[PDB]
Amino acid sequence: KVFGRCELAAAMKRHGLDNYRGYSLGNWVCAAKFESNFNTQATNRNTDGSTDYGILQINSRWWCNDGRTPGSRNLCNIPCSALLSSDITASVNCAKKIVSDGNGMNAWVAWRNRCKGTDVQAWIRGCRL
């Protein structure tokens, strides 16, 4: 599923990301944009052999299991295919785990580079929320 902008806002807010750990709903709907292009089935291999999976591109080395990245931790205790479904639940639940891990939303390099500091609010513009 390739989420709508105002569709992924609604679903993220409902699952409890708005202001989660002090991060405004625009922070999340900006990270998703530059991470997955609102595509749930966005997958991206990193050089170290691990893969980023889903709407938020969650790493298989730490968070989820794919059985092809030795040193997998699976700290979210889910298969990384869980993370590509049209239901953003598993993504959001794991993402709550990551953004609480220490460096907050800096865990997503896209967000660090392309969202952090900017007018994130512009991402929930027009959304009947």
From Swiss-Prot:
Its main location: secreted. The keyword Protein biosynthesis does not apply. The gene is LYZ. This is Lysozyme C. The lineage of its organism: Eukaryota, Metazoa, Chordata, Craniata, Vertebrata. Lysozyme C is capable of both hydrolysis and transglycosylation; it also shows a slight esterase activity. It acts rapidly on both peptide-substituted and unsubstituted peptidoglycan, and slowly on chitin oligosaccharides. Belongs to the glycosyl hydrolase 22 family. Disulfide bonds join 6-127, 30-115, 64-80, 76-94. It catalyses: Hydrolysis of (1->4)-beta-linkages between N-acetylmuramic acid and N-acetyl-D-glucosamine residues in a peptidoglycan and between N-acetyl-D-glucosamine residues in chitodextrins.
